[PDB]
Design a protein around this ligand. Structure first.
Ligand SMILES: Nc1ncnc2c1ncn2[C@@H]1O[C@H](COP(=O)(O)OP(=O)(O)OP(=O)(O)O)[C@@H](O)[C@H]1O
Ligand SMILES: [Mg+2]
Ligand SMILES: [Zn+2]
Lengths: 286, 76, 73, 252, 70, 191, 48, 50, 287
């Protein structure tokens, strides 16, 4: 239904400052706010946000509040001050997918049809992309309940823009990994993404904690993929997968062998370009 | 009677007026305390815009109610 | 106060010109506030195009002190 | 009410005139490249609201004076010589008033009135109707009068030309009108061009005696090319008149 | 640090930009152009332009006020 | 003036659906809400009047707003159908008044109960001592029909205005379908 | 120095003309009468 | 490299055409279509070199 | 008096609202408010920024109804925590930074209630990626301009560090206003979480690259690299010749071999060494 989402770094930042402004409560508060944006060409866009007053008490945690007058007038100001801008859905600060977010989405779907949510990070530590988004799908289906509804993650990335790329690249001024040569790939995804595969091997190790001791629902629809992964584990090293591998090493290295051969001759022509400027000035200048 | 003039600048200005006074006399009293002509001033009482042609009693402004002061804004 | 201020900005060096064409342009779609402008395309009457005697053409959205009825190309 | 006019006059004196330009091509999404009617070519930007896709190469736009960016697109101009050439005739003379030459009246009707109303007959035979025709004869036989019969029939897309207002002492302004008359002619598709006393602009040619008839033969050869050079000359009929057709260019 | 200053120099490549035409160069990194206002100029260049994309009769950008090669 | 915020909790439970009261049970309590929101507005212009429910789905039907045009629009075909759930009615009343724009207002709530409740008296007394630590004064007004000589509500008001509260009451319902404009003349006259 | 096209009634409001540039609406100075500023006559004019 | 940000704001140099020099260190130079200018020389340029 | 060491702290959060609102309506002069937190006579802190609906012309830009202003500030007090208007900004489109004759006028309106309303210009054109040219200002009295008296009584070695542009010096600087040196409030609260959130990927490197065409692309470069080396088998041969400073000015019409010949060697290396290494890890890891 939706291809992907596009998040600007402003709305990425426009939650953190509110997380600072309610950080004096100390005890517990999740930041929940209205997400504004304009989805076009089946691509979800996210532009602007604010945060709505929201509290939560732990005993009987089914009692939420959205001050809709604050939602009515401030969006009416925002529809005034940017008529290109509209509602796109909502968000919450999302540490660990709290329970009220099954009907918050159903509370305010009378504005946005595909009222998408966004889970963000306030304490960043990962090896992935710390912005997560779901979508609302419902089912009268296989086994669980007559009324069943579960969120599904549509893929997420941080979109840039020519206005804000001026800003963020001025705001970094920090340790950087520019000059992409032979080394940026080695550290953006060869040092890093191999350890990125750690926390996904270890993630399914964490579901594996129920062998005879963990939580009481057992499998039914979790193991059809896990049965496939050991089935779609790749081909063993006996076939011409051995032979055609040596074939292309015997082709890819020849281009490197030519290209390195050129590198020696070019700097040797540079060597004479310094022996023309060494000997032809010691008699001239002194 | 006393009134409150609560600006957008966190600041509250107290004035002594009469209920039959016009708004242009109120903005003249702010000019006596600040030095700003009444064209550069906008007075808001409970989300309503005030006009100099009417008095305080037409808008039911009484003793020690709160006004809002926003200034005129023209850039170039 | 207005007739004083008009007299100040009615000051006589006058770069005389020629009326090329007198428009009929429609309001735009879509305009928004925040960067709203009452000067471009909120009314339809009247815009015009002039040519000065320094061989310079100019567009004008606002005519000025003269109205649109008694003007013609 | 007198005060209400004096307040819009306050509202008048914030407006700034805008540079009339023209779009040449489009470099990137924001890099545009234009040339004013003043002079030099400029590289320019636009608004982020004003349809950056619609700026085709060719159109006429408006600019800012201070920052020099595109504020607005505009349609084409209609060059007020030609607007005051178009529809300023209140003449109401008719075919009942002309008399004696009804053979030519039906002859002249055939090129200007018949295929404009019923074109399907020529398409069946397989020939194209004529572009135009001329009227020669001794002076005072009804040459100018016969066009005035047709002039009381159209009123909006009939173009009478005196063939002496089209020349002036600037460099290219004599040939700019002939471009911008026929550009007005294609924009109003049922249209008739009338060209009275073409001997001023027609001529034959010369071995280049004076300096004056340098830039008239340029003004003449612009007319010859705009008739039948690389353009379907369609629905644009031309009527010309003279007292003596001795002094005409054989290429015309 | 050089790559940070490498990209910083193009703030002169802003939007009010006028058009000339390349004519010749006296020497390294200084050239002679002709604007579309009729008058020719002896201008300095900007260093990051590949010099080997010049002179058939090249269209060039010029600065608005200072009127140098852009 | 005096700082409070009047918060009405309407009754859209399914036992309020008949026609024993004369126009409608719905419209009779509606004009009772209409006259008290004219009594709180005209005695204090700062008080906004919005409505909440205490049904199975504790919805913000209308927002807490000083306009009643949304209140007047929703209370027609409001569909008063649903199981009563008053045990979360304390939480949806109290946490609403912490979403207000002023905490220096007096927390004043009225509650309309016109249905048999199935609460635990041991659960509300933990919620009543919760309101002792939250310093909340609620005048509960009984409508409709209920367990007569209202069970668990005398015990809740007593554990509401305890510990030097001594100011809240329990307006009980008479089991007679009379005109309800005279029943609520005691809260509008005094406290 | 310039060349005057015409005067007009009720007011000075002279129409002036220069060599290649535009035509302006001008006024006198204090040091000259409006008498000998008859039409079609070359006159000297400040630059501002 | 970072000098040129504070170097290119210096306005450009005109190009002209020498006709002939004269007494007291000056030359007669005309510009494109602009009139002839009697201008002086700089100290690093010889008159007989012009 | 003041010490010309004013040191306006802003933020990390406000400037992105400044440029986005400044650039979305760039050729018109958009503007807004500055909602911050005052500190002592020396420094000031501006933390939040919001705009208003406006109405403009070419040379002027105005505001509209003041009921937008008070209702906006009430909603920002109840959500978050209350603040106070420390100033105002506007946006010259592609100009630079100065106070024009109308920009100075509404500043004069705002400096009456508090005397430290900071006037801020943001140019979202001149800012390419680095410098963001901003240069906040504040008025000086033209009465002391009449006195010929030089204000602001320099008592710290901090003001005369950044030099003004000549174009802003053509305008009212320095006869009616002054410049202020500023920096940015940076913290792990924000600085860590825009770096480690923006330029990140997940699979772009544990994957192969169009395996039948990468080796095909390893001929799409090498084929013309032969003839480009034939030019390198040409250009060295015309040396021991006319004084190779001449071989700089002359060769600006056409491409040289020598620089272009080491250009593809970097490309023909990293395209191969990455694709060879990334394939030889999946042999180990995947069974
Ligand atoms: N056939 C005619 N019937 C009636 N009146 C005529 C006729 N021919 C000419 N006239 C009269 O002669 C006058 C001149 O007409 P017109 O200008 O058309 O002559 P012309 O042929 O155009 O001569 P020229 O080309 O020298 O002007 C008209 O006003 C008309 O009244
Ligand atoms: Mg005739
Ligand atoms: Zn400005």
């Amino acid at each position: 239904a939706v291809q992907k989402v596009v998040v600007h770094p402003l709305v990425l930042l426009s939650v953190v400052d509110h997380f600072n402004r309610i950080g004096k409560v100390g005890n517990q508060k999740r930041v929940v706010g209205v997400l504004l944006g304009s989805w076009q060409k089946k691509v979800l866009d996210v532009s602007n946000s604010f945060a709505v007053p929201f509290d939560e008490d732990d005993k009987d945690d089914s009692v939420w509040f959205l001050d809709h007058d604050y939602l009515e007038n401030m969006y009416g100001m925002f529809k005034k001050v940017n008529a290109r801008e509209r509602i796109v859905g909502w968000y919450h600060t999302g540490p660990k997918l709290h329970k009220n977010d099954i009907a918050i989405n159903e509370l305010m779907k009378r504005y946005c049809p595909n009222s998408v949510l966004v889970i963000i990070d306030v304490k960043p530590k990962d090896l992935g992309l710390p912005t997560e988004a779901y979508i609302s799908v419902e089912e009268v289906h296989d086994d669980g309940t007559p009324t069943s509804k579960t969120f599904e993650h549509v893929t997420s990335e941080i979109g840039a823009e020519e206005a804000e790329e001026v800003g963020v690249e001025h705001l970094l001024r920090d340790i950087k990994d520019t000059t992409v040569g032979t080394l940026s790939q080695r550290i953006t995804n060869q040092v890093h993404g191999l350890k990125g595969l750690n926390s996904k091997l270890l993630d399914i190790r964490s579901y594996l904690e129920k062998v005879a001791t963990g939580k009481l629902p057992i499998n039914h629809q979790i193991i059809y993929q896990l049965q496939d992964v050991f089935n779609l584990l790749p081909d063993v090293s006996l076939q011409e997968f051995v032979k055609a591998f040596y074939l292309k090493t015997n082709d890819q290295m020849v281009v490197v062998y030519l290209a390195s051969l050129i590198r020696s001759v070019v700097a040797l022509h540079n060597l004479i370009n310094n022996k023309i400027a060494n000997r032809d000035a010691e008699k001239k200048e002194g | 009677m006393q009134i409150f003039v609560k600006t957008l600048t966190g600041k509250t200005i107290t004035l002594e007026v009469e209920p039959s006074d016009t708004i242009e006399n109120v903005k003249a009293k702010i000019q006596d305390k600040e030095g700003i002509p009444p064209d550069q001033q906008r007075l808001i009482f409970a989300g309503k815009q005030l006009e100099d042609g009417r008095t305080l009693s037409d808008y039911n402004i009484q003793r020690e109610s709160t006004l809002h002061l926003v200034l005129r804004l023209r850039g170039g | 106060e207005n007739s004083e201020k008009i007299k100040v900005n009615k000051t006589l060096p006058y770069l005389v010109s020629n009326v090329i064409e007198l428009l009929d342009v429609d309001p735009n779609d879509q305009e928004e506030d925040g960067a709203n402008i009452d000067l471009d395309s909120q009314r339809k009457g009247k815009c015009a195009v002039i040519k000065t005697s320094t061989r310079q053409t100019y567009f004008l959205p606002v005519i000025g002190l003269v109205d649109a009825e008694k003007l013609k190309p | 009410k007198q005060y209400e006019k004096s307040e819009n006059d306050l509202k008048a004196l914030q407006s700034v005139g805008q540079i009339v330009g023209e779009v040449l091509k489009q470099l990137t999404e924001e890099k545009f490249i234009v040339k004013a009617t003043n002079g030099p070519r400029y590289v320019v930007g636009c608004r982020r609201q004003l349809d950056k896709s619609k700026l085709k190469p060719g159109t006429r736009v408006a600019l800012d004076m201070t920052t020099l960016t595109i504020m607005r697109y505009l349609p084409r101009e209609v060059d007020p010589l030609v607007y005051n050439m178009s529809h300023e005739d209140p003449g109401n003379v008719s075919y009942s008033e002309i008399g004696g030459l009804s053979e030519q009246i039906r002859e002249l009707r055939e090129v200007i009135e018949l295929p404009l109303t019923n074109p399907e007959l020529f398409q069946r035979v397989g020939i194209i109707p004529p572009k135009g025709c001329l009227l020669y004869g001794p002076p005072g036989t009804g040459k100018t009068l016969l066009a005035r019969a047709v002039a009381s029939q159209l009123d909006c897309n009939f173009l009478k030309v005196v063939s002496s207002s089209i020349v002036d002492k600037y460099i290219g302004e004599s040939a700019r009108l002939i471009r911008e008359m026929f550009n007005y002619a294609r924009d109003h598709q049922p249209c008739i061009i009338f060209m009275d006393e073409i001997d001023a602009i027609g001529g034959r040619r010369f071995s280049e005696g004076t300096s004056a008839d340098r830039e008239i033969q340029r003004t003449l050869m612009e007319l010859l090319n705009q008739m039948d050079g690389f353009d379907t000359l369609h629905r644009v009929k031309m009527i010309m008149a003279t007292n003596r057709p001795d002094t005409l260019d054989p290429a015309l | 640090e050089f790559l940070h200053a490498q990209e910083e120099v193009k703030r002169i490549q802003s939007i009010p930009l006028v058009i000339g035409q390349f004519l010749e160069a006296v020497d390294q990194n200084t050239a002679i152009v002709g604007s579309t206002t009729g008058s020719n100029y002896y201008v300095r260049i900007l260093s990051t332009i590949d010099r080997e994309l010049l002179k058939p009769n090249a269209s060039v950008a010029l600065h608005k006020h200072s009127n140098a090669l852009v | 003036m005096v700082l409070e915020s009047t918060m009405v909790c309407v009754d859209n439970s399914e036992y309020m659906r008949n026609g024993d009261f004369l126009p409608t049970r719905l419209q009779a309590q509606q004009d009772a809400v209409n006259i008290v929101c004219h009594s709180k507005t005209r005695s204090n212009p700062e008080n906004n009047v919005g409505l909440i429910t205490l049904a199975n789905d504790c919805e913000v039907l209308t927002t807490l707003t000083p306009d009643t045009g949304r209140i007047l629009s929703k209370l027609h075909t409001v569909q008063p159908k649903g199981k009563i759930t008053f045990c979360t009615g304390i939480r949806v009343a109290h946490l609403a008044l912490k979403h207000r724009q002023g905490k220096n207002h007096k927390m004043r709530i009225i509650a309309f109960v016109g249905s048999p409740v199935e609460d635990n008296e041991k659960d509300l007394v933990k919620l009543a001592k919760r309101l002792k630590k939250e310093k909340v004064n609620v005048d509960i007004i009984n409508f409709g029909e209920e367990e007569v000589n209202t069970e668990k509500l005398t015990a809740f008001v007593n554990t509401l205005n305890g510990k030097d509260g001594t100011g809240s009451h329990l307006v009980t319902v008479p089991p007679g379908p009379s005109l309800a404009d005279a029943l609520i003349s005691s809260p509008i006259l005094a406290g | 120095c310039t060349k005057i096209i015409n005067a007009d009634s009720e007011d000075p409001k002279y129409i002036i003309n220069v060599k290649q540039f535009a035509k302006f609406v001008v006024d006198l100075s204090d040091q000259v009468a409006p008498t000998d500023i008859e039409e079609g006559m070359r006159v000297g004019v400040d630059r501002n | 490299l970072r000098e040129e940000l504070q170097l290119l704001q210096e306005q450009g140099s005109y190009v002209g055409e020498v006709v002939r020099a004269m007494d007291k260190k000056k030359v007669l130079v005309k510009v494109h279509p602009e009139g002839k200018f009697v201008v002086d020389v700089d100290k690093n340029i010889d008159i007989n070199d012009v | 008096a003041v010490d010309t060491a004013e040191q306006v702290y802003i933020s990390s959060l406000a400037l992105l609202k400044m440029l986005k609102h400044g650039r979305a309506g760039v050729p018109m002069e958009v503007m807004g408010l500055m909602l911050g937190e005052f500190v002592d006579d020396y420094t000031v802190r501006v933390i939040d920024v919001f705009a208003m609906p406006q109405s403009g012309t070419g040379v002027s830009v105005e505001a509209v109804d003041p009921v937008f202003q008070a209702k906006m500030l009430d909603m920002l007090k109840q959500t978050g925590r209350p603040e106070m208007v420390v100033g105002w900004y506007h946006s010259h489109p592609g100009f630079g930074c100065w106070l024009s004759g109308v920009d100075i006028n509404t500043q004069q309106s705002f400096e009456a209630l508090s005397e430290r309303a900071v006037a801020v210009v943001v140019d979202p054109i001149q800012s390419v990626k680095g410098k963001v040219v901003i240069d906040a200002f504040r008025l000086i009295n033209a009465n002391m301009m009449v006195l010929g008296h030089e204000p602001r009584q320099t008592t710290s070695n901090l003001g005369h560090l950044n030099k003004p542009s000549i174009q802003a010096l053509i305008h009212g600087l320095n006869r009616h206003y002054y410049s202020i040196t500023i920096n940015y409030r940076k913290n792990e609260l924000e600085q860590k979480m825009l770096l480690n959130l923006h330029k990140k990927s997940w699979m772009e490197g544990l994957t192969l690259q169009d395996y039948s065409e990468h080796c095909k692309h390893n001929e799409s470069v090498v084929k013309e690299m032969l003839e480009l080396a034939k030019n390198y088998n040409k250009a060295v041969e015309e040396e021991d010749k006319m004084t190779p400073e001449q071989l700089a000015i002359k060769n600006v019409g056409k491409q040289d071999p020598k620089r272009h010949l080491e250009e593809h060697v970097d490309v023909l290396m990293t395209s191969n060494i990455v694709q060879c290494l990334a394939a030889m890890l999946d042999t180990v890891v995947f069974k």
